[PDB]
Structures are given as structure tokens and as C-alpha cells.
Amino acid sequence: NNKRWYFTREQLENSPSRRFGVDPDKELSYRQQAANLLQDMGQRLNVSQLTINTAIVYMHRFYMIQSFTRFPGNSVAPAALFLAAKVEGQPKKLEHVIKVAHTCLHPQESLPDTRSEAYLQQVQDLVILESIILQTLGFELTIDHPHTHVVKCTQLVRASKDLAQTSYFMATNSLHLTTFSLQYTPPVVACVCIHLACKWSNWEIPVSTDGKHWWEYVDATVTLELLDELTHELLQILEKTPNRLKRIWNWR
């Protein structure tokens, strides 16, 4: 369906990982870690933030079906990134992905002889995993890219370069840090990020001459009640994340 990859809060609590004894808290970590690894590998592999985001969504969704107890993020991440790069038209070679993943996970360790049996195995392992990812997602790899939605919103609100830059920051961080993508459509997430960026920069969006709020021009469903609940959730996890907020903090 359209609702196939969207989950109620109740459904997120009953995740495959919870079913194997993993705390809700532990699981959010496992996700944040995977998204870190994706971000790190993706930066070294020189891929776009769009490609990394795709890989993060793949990851988020993969773990609504599979458990972290059976497939560790350090195994899935590289496979997800390999796939996302192919899908987004920035293909990276299998050997190269393997190499970069190796340095990330084991900075001190030494790369295996590419002639070895141990190495041939891990090549084969990554290919196997990509295939398990493909089938888990039932081959649905076209992702709606949320950055597009953000740019559009910041135009409607005539945001400064700064406001927009902060909105994009909120956007990228929501994927690494929250399961919003599993619960809310890209356009709604965009509103949330813009809402919070305003709140943070102390910008106020003028009530239309119609007395109608902006987000209404963006998604019918969206309400101020929902936005405050979500921006709050997003802010709290930002506050937990060392140095993240410093990047958008007005230091002057």
C-alpha cells in the first residue's frame, strides 16, 4: 500500500527487535548508530547526502521487519549504502564499499589480503545482505526525498538563507535521530523541521491575511498541536546529542 511503510506508535513499540528482548531505548540507539555509520561511510565514499538519506530510510524500514538481534547494524549499513548508491545513480564498487566499511569499523586493524578466503567471504556476505534487504523492502526503493519538501517550505515562508540552512539541519538530523520517517509523510516532517527552526531562531511566521497558518498551504492534515508535540520530541533528542546544537547555535 501507500500506508505500508507507515507505522502507528503502538506498532513501533512492538518492533521485531522488541520481540527479541531489546529495549525501546536500546533500539533507538541501534538506529542512531547505523545512521552515523552510513553518514561516515557516505562522506568518505564521496556520495551525496541524498544517497545517504535513502540508505538511512532503507535501514529504518528494514528494521521494522527484521530484528537487530539477527542482523547487526554494522552489517546492514554498508549493504544498505551499497544499494542506495546504485539506486541513486552514484554506484560505488563493491570492493570500495567493503574497504571503506572496514576502515570505519576497524580503524586500527589491517585490511585482509584481497586474495584471501576471509575476504572473498565478506564480499559474498555483503551481496547476500543486499539481497535480503531488497526482499525485505519487497523491492520498493523509490524514496520521497525530504530535502525537496524543505526547500519548498522555506520559499513559502520567505526564509533567510540562515533560516533555510537551519531547517535543512533539522531535517537531516531528524532522519539520524528519530523514527519520524517511519511515522510521518515527508511533507509533514518538513513542516516540523521548519517549525522548530523558526522557534530556535526566534523567527515568527506572519499569520496570513486570511488568518491562515503556513503549514496549511503545505499539508492538510497538519496542525499546530501535532507540530508542537513533534518539534518538542525532536528538540529533546537534539539536546541529548553532544555538539549537534552547537552547529546551529548563534555564537555572537
Binding site: 546504485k86 539506486v87 543486499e130 531488497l134
Partner: protein, 309 residues
């Protein structure tokens, strides 16, 4: 064993017949084991794939998932095997235009030929509107269902396009390949598919591919012997292709499109439309929108439904 809600094993289908037997490999007709629904199965071939799941298959899948239209073949689902293999599953279509056309028993009225071209051009309008180039137009890729609905098929060479573009030049079967590509173009668009529609339209009367070259040069020669010869007068800026002179095109040739096909076709409107499809300059070549609007589809006998096949 691993959970897998969204990818069913292909054994749900029962193989009936290796219909394709093609160098393209391999299409099976099959039957849903519970409902009897007929489908076509295509295995993703992984013979020379060192880069995991073929980027080529991802592209095709992405495209079939996007394209939903009465005149475009319908991908039902993707199936696994349970080992390991992968299969694209399509709604099955009884006929294919290449087969019908080479069958001496089969006969089209002017009215039905109109209908066929209408559906085909309508499919093209749809895929192009969705930023897709088919890149493999030919009679054999045009299917027709038991109920007379035409479907464009085989998106394995298709690709999205946009907005200076550097697309792959060696696309499209030689006989259906437009001048642009043969002259080395990499910044081409929807007009390449329409050139193909032209060759197919003509084929609805000639019952055989009009221009059967053996090499690119032979192909380019054949095209010149039909459409006149490639001239910066006829095709503004054609000279700036590297191969234009560097490929000794002919010089006396003049347009014989209507004369050489005059025999088979007869109907003035049909000849006029074919002439506007087989235009040399891609930018002067008629598009699906205007083609659909052409008087050919709006004069008697008006287009009719498909029957006796």
C-alpha cells in the same frame, strides 16, 4: 530462515511454457496456482554480475513501478525463489505485434490499424510525460491483449531523462534507430521513440521492417534512400556532429517516403502521419501529442476495436 512478508516465492506461479526462447532470456508464460490468472515471468539474469544485484535491473524495476497506464505493460510484483533467483512478474498478453504482422492469415482493416497506432502513441505520450525514454521501440516490444488492448513492453533499456545530457548512444535496435543516434547524439530525447513509432506504423502495411540495415553506415544509407539525405538545409546544425562528413553520407537522394510507401498504404492521412514521424531533424519530428491530433485519427473510417486477434 528469514522473514519475508513482501517478496513471495515464484512457485506460487506454475510454469506453462518458455514463450520467449529469446536471446533475451527468459520469458515464461505461467499460471497462478490458485486463481488461474496468467502472467509472464522474466528471471533477472545474473550471469556476469560482479556488482551484486544488477543496477540495470534496479533501473527497470524503478521504471515499471512508476509507469501505470492502460497501454503500458503491468508489473504485478517481484518474486524470489527460496534457493537464489529473482523474477519480474507481469500481466500476461496473448499477442505481440511482430508475430501478428508476420502471420499471413492475420488481417488488419484501416480502422484497426488506426486503433493500434492510437494506443501506441497514447502509451508514448504517457511514458514521456513521466520523463521516461523507452529506447527500444520495435514491433516485437508491442503487445496486444486477448481483448485488444495494446501494451508497450520491455523497459530493460529504458531510462529517465531531464531538463547538456550525456546519454548512451548505442541504444535502440539498428532497424528502428533514428538518425540522431547514428550521427553520434548523446543529448537526445522523446523524438527517438517517435521515429520508432514511424517505422512501426509503416510496418502495419508493409508487414515487414522498412529499413533493414546491416551496419550503422548501411542503416544510414537506407534512411537517406527514403527520407532524402541529411543536409544542414533539411536538418539545421546536423553538420556539427563529428561523423556528419566523417561518414560519407550520400548526396543526390531526395524524400521518397510517400512515394515508396504510396503502394502499401493508400490512405492519404496515414501517409501524411508516417511522413511526419520519419522526419530527419528530431526537433522537426512530430510528437505524440500532435500525432494523436492528426486527421488520421479523426476521419473515416474512425478507429475501431480489435478483433479476430
Amino acid at each position: 530462515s528469514v522473514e519475508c512478508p513482501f517478496c513471495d516465492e515464484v512457485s506460487k506461479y506454475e510454469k506453462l511454457a518458455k514463450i520467449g526462447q529469446g536471446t533475451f532470456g527468459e520469458v515464461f508464460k505461467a499460471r497462478h496456482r490458485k486463481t488461474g490468472q496468467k502472467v509472464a515471468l522474466k528471471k533477472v539474469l545474473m550471469e556476469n554480475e560482479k556488482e551484486g544485484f544488477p543496477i540495470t535491473a534496479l533501473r527497470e524495476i524503478k521504471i515499471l513501478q512508476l509507469l501505470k497506464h492502460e497501454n503500458v505493460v503491468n508489473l504485478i510484483e517481484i518474486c524470489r525463489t527460496k534457493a537464489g533467483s529473482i523474477y519480474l512478474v507481469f500481466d500476461f498478453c496473448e499477442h505481440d505485434l511482430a508475430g501478428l504482422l508476420s502471420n499471413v492469415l492475420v488481417k488488419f482493416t484501416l480502422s484497426e490499424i488506426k486503433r493500434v497506432m492510437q494506443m501506441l502513441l497514447n502509451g508514448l505520450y504517457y511514458i514521456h510525460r513521466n520523463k521516461i525514454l523507452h529506447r527500444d521501440m520495435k514491433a516485437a516490444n508491442v503487445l496486444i491483449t486477448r481483448d485488444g488492448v495494446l501494451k508497450l513492453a520491455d523497459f530493460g533499456l529504458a531510462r529517465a531523462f531531464s531538463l547538456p545530457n550525456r546519454y548512451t548512444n548505442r541504444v535502440v535496435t539498428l532497424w528502428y534507430r533514428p538518425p540522431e543516434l547514428l550521427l553520434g547524439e548523446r543529448d537526445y530525447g522523446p523524438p527517438i521513440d517517435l521515429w520508432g513509432a514511424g517505422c512501426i506504423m509503416a510496418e502495419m502495411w508493409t508487414r515487414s521492417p522498412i529499413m533493414q540495415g546491416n551496419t550503422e553506415q548501411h542503416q544510414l544509407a537506407l534512411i537517406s534512400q527514403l527520407c532524402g539525405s541529411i543536409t544542414p538545409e533539411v536538418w539545421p546544425n546536423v553538420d556539427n556532429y563529428e561523423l556528419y562528413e566523417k561518414l560519407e553520407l550520400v548526396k543526390g537522394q531526395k524524400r521518397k517516403v510517400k512515394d515508396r510507401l504510396k503502394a502499401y498504404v493508400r490512405d492519404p492521412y496515414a501517409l501524411d502521419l508516417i511522413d511526419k514521424l520519419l522526419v530527419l531533424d528530431p526537433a522537426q519530428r512530430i510528437d505524440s501529442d500532435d500525432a494523436l491530433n492528426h486527421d488520421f485519427f479523426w476521419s473515416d473510417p474512425m478507429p475501431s476495436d480489435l478483433k479476430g486477434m
